[PDB]
Structure formats: structure tokens, C-alpha cells
């Protein structure tokens, strides 16, 4: 109801979290936030701590905190991750610094149970299928992904995956680490910065994960730029002219012009032993024009998802406002905001 | 090598040889679906049992594998054993599923309490069943750990099973199976509170014995800790013998925080019962797992004087479970699992 809170030190730092919380491990694989495993001894599950740091340092590090925030209270479907708790040690806006944020204690992700692995069909169907049904959620409440790679999923014992860590990366040009294996599952259009782009975006990455689960490889493993797109190009060939009226950016336009032609490989051939379904599959995700780039919805009916799709059970999320972005406050109104979803935070019905 | 026909239940594909025909889904199985069906060469029901994602996950691997040899390793009357197990994979590198077949059961015993009330004669009969199982499940090392109305069954000579057994992961609190549902779990398995022994079992046998003889339930519970509260209202707050025996001092606090309540004397719960059915339930509802009492002791109880005979309470060959301690890859296990699969030989007639 009004928990107690007690105090120690573990990160060189004090944390400071409700009692129901218990042995707290730093099990941390991250900076920009500490977290620590623990005991929650309400619900009887290991969960994960998450003590931000300088939640408001800026404007910028505010209007972070209170997007990611709403965005976590917001998702609750079994494929996204989600929110068990959030909390401030503070009693009083006056003495509020200090956010917590409780998720599971999440197992692996899908690098670590696909090594070289060319995993079974009906293994590979399961996995995308999952994937799929949170990106129809994610994308109905006008959120799109981004970074979507295979460290971003967590897969259970069970084969049950969550989709982690929506999108801080907002556009290109921002705070991209890792400039050599991130790019792999990144879409042609953001890569390149052109104007043509919508929520598929995250529908190339799932093509260039489920490739790699069926093949056991890396699809388009490029050094940098232009060996990823010319990698990519080899296999879906350069963009008709339909594509390249679409196109805004002239640097952008004229680059591709350049480009020397290349035919749009057979994927049978590429893919060779798969299911047709999946070949098939694969030929409407991989695609470079994001008009004709298949959607989540329409991919869950496609038929190679025929034992696992219906409809009833594919929720989309209820609707989502987002007018605080392109708002102008001071620091402290951002504060405030932020105080307000801890103090208001309902845990999900059980 | 026989014919398989393909098919679709409840969101899974079921590629099952010719002979098993009508198959209809019966409820669903520890990690895994049940399909009832009638085998052709025997003209028997049958329960068909697919294994759910068996090599997906190193655990899901050493789950089946484990499964398998137990099932395979069993024999007794009252426990459930195999008729016949198959893959459709004709290779090692094909195999992705597994089957399981026994005997198609008549009831389980939440749907004889609905049925009909139990003569205190009957109740002796089922639970002497189940002990005289449990003794054999016990005398190779095992324990079930998810002993409940759901995992027994009866044909229609009365004759009892027991069916589904644990998968032997620590996986406490969080449930390999289904969320939520408790009831018949000992409490020292829900509270972490030392090294439990195999009359966990006999906790929930008891449980069992009681909504028997008792149309009610016995810990009718909405969660943990409510379960407590209703275990601790019969049963009494523990001693400062078993306060010492508890390893965990994080358990310690909750005991001490909560209110002290003396043992109830099982006459005034259980009115109107036969005296050796109460004074059977003491020794198996006591709390310290050291005095309570084993299959063994129960089956030579005065309860089952009618039934007893030691010369026809038999135990379980030799085990080998030394692959317990092995971490093996998906592969090492499967390829074990394939192992078990080809050898198999069905039970005469
Ligand atoms: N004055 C500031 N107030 C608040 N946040 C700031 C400020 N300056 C930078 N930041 C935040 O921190 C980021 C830069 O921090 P940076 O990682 O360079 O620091 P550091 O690694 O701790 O220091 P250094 O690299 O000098 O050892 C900015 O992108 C912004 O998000
Ligand atoms: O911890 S995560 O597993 N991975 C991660 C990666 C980059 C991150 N950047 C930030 C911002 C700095 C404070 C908030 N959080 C980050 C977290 C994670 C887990 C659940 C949701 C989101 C993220
Ligand atoms: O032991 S099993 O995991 N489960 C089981 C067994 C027999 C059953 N017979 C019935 C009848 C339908 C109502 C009673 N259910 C049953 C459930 C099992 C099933 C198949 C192969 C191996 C193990």
C-alpha cells in the first residue's frame, strides 16, 4: 500500500528501494543507468533494478526520462517488455532526484541462442511470429523501433521472446555506438537519409534477423557504408525509377544514380532448402521501397504463419498521446511531469 | 516404419503414425498437448502426448530427455507408463519432435468428487494407490513435487495412476508450466526453507486424502500468502527446533512478524471421521519434513490394513541418473534423446 524503504550501498552509490525488494546483485551490462538484480518477495519472481542516473541533468536528459517513462507505462503485451514498478525514495516533489525502474529479470537475448545455429523451421516461425505481434502493438500506438537487432530480444527457456529497448536512437544522425555490427539490420532509407520512410523501417530488420536465423550467417555484414549498401543492393538489386522520384535528397538521389545496375537475386536460390513460405516471406520484407515494404499486420496473415496467427489475439495498443514532444518547458515542469507518472504508477493487473 | 498422417489442433501441427485415429484434444500436459485417440492394432484409447518445442532451449533438451527416461524406466500398476513413443524423423538430423502414448485414463479425481461422494472404504482404496506409486516413484530417487487431483486418474476398476511428474529444475515461485495455482504444494517448497525431502510428496498426498473424505478443499488459497495463513491455522506455528533447521534467515523475519497460533487437534476439523484416517493426516500434514512420515510407513498403516501386503509393494530397478550433473549441448542431448527413441521397445502385449 505505502511501502517502507531501507538504504545500502552497492555501486559505490546508495539505493535506496522498497523492502519487498531483497539481496539486489549489481548484475549490471550497461552504463548511462546502473542496475541490479533482486528478490521481489510480493510477486516471488528475480527482477532487475533499474536506478537511472542524472535523470535531469538537462532539458535534453529530462525530455528523455519522461518519454522513456510513458512510453514503458504505456506497452503492455506479451511480446515488449513492460513495467512491473517505478519509484522515487523522495516523499515530496521538493526532494525528488532520485527514479527506479522493476522489469523481469529477462533471460538471454537471440545472439546467444543463435551462434551458427540455421535453427529449425518451426523454430525460426515461432520466433518471427512473436516479433511480429509486438511490432503490430508497438506500431499502432505510432511508435517506430529503429535499432532493432537480435541483442534487442529476449528469448525465454520457453521460446517466448520480448521485444526490448524501443528507440533513443531517433534519427540517423544521433547517438549511434557501434559503428561496424549495428548497421547490419539497419534500413537502406535511414542508412542513407532519404525522405521515404515509414514504420516498415523495423520490418527490414526483422528480415535481415529472420534471414540470419534460417541461414545460421549474418545477411548483410558491411565494414561501413558502402559496402552495406552494396551488399544489399546484390541481393534486392538497385531501385527501379518508380523509387527514385519518391526521393527528396538530390546528394541522396544522385549517389544511388551512380550505382552501376544490379539484378534483383532469386531468394530460392540465396535461401536454398527453405520453406517456400519463408522465401516468399523473406521477398516482402526485403524490400527497398517503403511503400511497397510488407507491414506487421499484413505479415501476420501471411501464410506461413498459418498455425500460429489469429487475429483475436494480436492486440493493438490503446492510443497513445504524444503532443508533450514539440513542447517548450523549463526543467523543472519536465521534472514535475516525471514526478507525477511515479506517483500515479499502477502495476499491471495480475 | 509406418504411415504418418498430418493435422492441426489447437495451433500445432500433429504428424502422428495411421494406426492412432481420431485424435481430439484432452486438456493440455506438462510441457507439452494430450490428444485422446483410438489405436486400430490394439482397439484401445489411447492418450498421445507431443512433446512442446523439445530442442528449442538446452533446458527444453534436458527436460525430454529426462522425461523420457523416466517414463521409460518406470513400471509399476499405479504409475503411468509408455506404450509407444515415435518421431516422424526418419534422421537424427530431421528430429524436432517427440511422442509420447499410454493408456487413455478414465477420470482424474477432481471429476470423481464432482461425480459421486466418497465411502470412507473408497478413499482408502485410492489413496492406498497412490502411496503404493509413490513408494515405487520414490524408491529410484525421484519426486514428484506436483502431486494434485489433476495428475491422478482412474480407470473404470478403480484402478489409479499417477501421471505428469515434476521436472526436477529449482525453478521455485515461477512455474515450469502454468502461472498461478498452488493448493497442494508443502510449504517448505513455497518458502525455500531447507533441503527437501521426498515427503513433499506425502504433504500433498495428504491434502489429496482430506478433500476426499471432505467434499471442501483443505488450503483453499487466493495467494502465497494467504496459503500460509490457512496452512498455519490448522497445522500451528513452527518450533524453535524447526526455526534452527531453516537455513534462510530472510524467512526468519516473515515468521517471527506474523501472529503465533497453537497446533488444532484434527478430531474437531475432521468430525464425524474414521479416527485412523485423522490420525493418518497428523503424520502426513505434520510441518517438520523429518517427522513426517514416508509412502513406506503409510502403506504399512492400520488405514490399509484391508490392502496391505508387503509381498505385492514393489520397488523400482536400479536408476542411473548421473546425467543429472552433465551440461551438455542441445545436439549431446538430443542425440541421447534419439538414442532412447530407437531403442525403445514396447511392453509385451
Ligand atoms: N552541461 C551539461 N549539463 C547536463 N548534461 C550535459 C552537459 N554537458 C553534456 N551533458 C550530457 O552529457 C553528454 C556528454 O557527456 P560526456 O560523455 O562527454 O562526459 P564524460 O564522459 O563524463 O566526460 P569526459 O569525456 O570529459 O571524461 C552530452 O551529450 C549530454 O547528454
Ligand atoms: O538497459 S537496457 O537493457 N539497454 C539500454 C541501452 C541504452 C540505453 N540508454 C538509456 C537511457 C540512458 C538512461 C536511459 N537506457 C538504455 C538501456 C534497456 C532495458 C529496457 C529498456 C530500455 C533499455
Ligand atoms: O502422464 S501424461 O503426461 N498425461 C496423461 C496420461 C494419461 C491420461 N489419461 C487421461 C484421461 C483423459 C482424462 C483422463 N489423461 C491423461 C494424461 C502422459 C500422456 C501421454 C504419454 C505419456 C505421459
Given at each position: 500500500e505505502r511501502p517502507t524503504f531501507y538504504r545500502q550501498e552497492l555501486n559505490k552509490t546508495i539505493w535506496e528501494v522498497p523492502?519487498?525488494?531483497?539481496?539486489?546483485?549489481?548484475v549490471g551490462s550497461g552504463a548511462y543507468g546502473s542496475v541490479c538484480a533482486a528478490f521481489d518477495?510480493?510477486?516471488?519472481h528475480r527482477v532487475a533494478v533499474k536506478k537511472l542516473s542524472?535523470?535531469?541533468?538537462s532539458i535534453i536528459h529530462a525530455k528523455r526520462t519522461y518519454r522513456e517513462l510513458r512510453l514503458l507505462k504505456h506497452m503492455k503485451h506479451e511480446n515488449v517488455i513492460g513495467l512491473l514498478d517505478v519509484f522515487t525514495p523522495a516523499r515530496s516533489l521538493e526532494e525528488f532526484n532520485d527514479v527506479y525502474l522493476v522489469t523481469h529479470l529477462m533471460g538471454a537475448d537471440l545472439n546467444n541462442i543463435v551462434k551458427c545455429q540455421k535453427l529449425t523451421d518451426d523454430h525460426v516461425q515461432f520466433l518471427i511470429y512473436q516479433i511480429l505481434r509486438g511490432l503490430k502493438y508497438i506500431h499502432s500506438a505510432?511508435?517506430?523501433?529503429?535499432?532493432?537487432?537480435?541483442?534487442?530480444l529476449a528469448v525465454n527457456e520457453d521460446s517466448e521472446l520480448k521485444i526490448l529497448d524501443?528507440?533513443?536512437?531517433?534519427?540517423?544522425?544521433?547517438?549511434?555506438?557501434?559503428?561496424?555490427?549495428?548497421?547490419?539490420?539497419?534500413?537502406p532509407e535511414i542508412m542513407l537519409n532519404?525522405?521515404?520512410?515509414?514504420?516498415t523501417v523495423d520490418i527490414w530488420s526483422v528480415g535481415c534477423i529472420m534471414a540470419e536465423l534460417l541461414?545460421?550467417?549474418?545477411l548483410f555484414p558491411g565494414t561501413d557504408h558502402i559496402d552495406q549498401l552494396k551488399l544489399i543492393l546484390r541481393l534486392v538489386g538497385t531501385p527501379g525509377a518508380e523509387l527514385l522520384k519518391k526521393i527528396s535528397s538530390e546528394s541522396a538521389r544522385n549517389y544511388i544514380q551512380s550505382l552501376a545496375q544490379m539484378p534483383k537475386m532469386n531468394f530460392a536460390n540465396v535461401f536454398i532448402g527453405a520453406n517456400p513460405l519463408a522465401v516468399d516471406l523473406l521477398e516482402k520484407m526485403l524490400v527497398l521501397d517503403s511503400d511497397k515494404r510488407i507491414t506487421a499486420a499484413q505479415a501476420l496473415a501471411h501464410a506461413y504463419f498459418a498455425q500460429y496467427h489469429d487475429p483475436d489475439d494480436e492486440p493493438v495498443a490503446d492510443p497513445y498521446d504524444?503532443?508533450?514532444?514539440?513542447r517548450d518547458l523549463l526543467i523543472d515542469e519536465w521534472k514535475s511531469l516525471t514526478y507525477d507518472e511515479v506517483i500515479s504508477f499502477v502495476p499491471p493487473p495480475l
Amino acid at each position: 500500500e505505502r511501502p517502507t524503504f531501507y538504504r545500502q550501498e552497492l555501486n559505490k552509490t546508495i539505493w535506496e528501494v522498497p523492502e519487498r525488494y531483497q539481496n539486489l546483485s549489481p548484475v549490471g551490462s550497461g552504463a548511462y543507468g546502473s542496475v541490479c538484480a533482486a528478490f521481489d518477495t510480493k510477486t516471488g519472481h528475480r527482477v532487475a533494478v533499474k536506478k537511472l542516473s542524472r535523470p535531469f541533468q538537462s532539458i535534453i536528459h529530462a525530455k528523455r526520462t519522461y518519454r522513456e517513462l510513458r512510453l514503458l507505462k504505456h506497452m503492455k503485451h506479451e511480446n515488449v517488455i513492460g513495467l512491473l514498478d517505478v519509484f522515487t525514495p523522495a516523499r515530496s516533489l521538493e526532494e525528488f532526484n532520485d527514479v527506479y525502474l522493476v522489469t523481469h529479470l529477462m533471460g538471454a537475448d537471440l545472439n546467444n541462442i543463435v551462434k551458427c545455429q540455421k535453427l529449425t523451421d518451426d523454430h525460426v516461425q515461432f520466433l518471427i511470429y512473436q516479433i511480429l505481434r509486438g511490432l503490430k502493438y508497438i506500431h499502432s500506438a505510432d511508435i517506430i523501433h529503429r535499432d532493432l537487432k537480435p541483442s534487442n530480444l529476449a528469448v525465454n527457456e520457453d521460446s517466448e521472446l520480448k521485444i526490448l529497448d524501443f528507440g533513443l536512437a531517433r534519427h540517423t544522425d544521433d547517438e549511434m555506438t557501434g559503428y561496424v555490427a549495428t548497421r547490419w539490420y539497419r534500413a537502406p532509407e535511414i542508412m542513407l537519409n532519404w525522405m521515404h520512410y515509414n514504420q516498415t523501417v523495423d520490418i527490414w530488420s526483422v528480415g535481415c534477423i529472420m534471414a540470419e536465423l534460417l541461414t545460421g550467417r549474418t545477411l548483410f555484414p558491411g565494414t561501413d557504408h558502402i559496402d552495406q549498401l552494396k551488399l544489399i543492393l546484390r541481393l534486392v538489386g538497385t531501385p527501379g525509377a518508380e523509387l527514385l522520384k519518391k526521393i527528396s535528397s538530390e546528394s541522396a538521389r544522385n549517389y544511388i544514380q551512380s550505382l552501376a545496375q544490379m539484378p534483383k537475386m532469386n531468394f530460392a536460390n540465396v535461401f536454398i532448402g527453405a520453406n517456400p513460405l519463408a522465401v516468399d516471406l523473406l521477398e516482402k520484407m526485403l524490400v527497398l521501397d517503403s511503400d511497397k515494404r510488407i507491414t506487421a499486420a499484413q505479415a501476420l496473415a501471411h501464410a506461413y504463419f498459418a498455425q500460429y496467427h489469429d487475429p483475436d489475439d494480436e492486440p493493438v495498443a490503446d492510443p497513445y498521446d504524444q503532443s508533450f514532444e514539440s513542447r517548450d518547458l523549463l526543467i523543472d515542469e519536465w521534472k514535475s511531469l516525471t514526478y507525477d507518472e511515479v506517483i500515479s504508477f499502477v502495476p499491471p493487473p495480475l
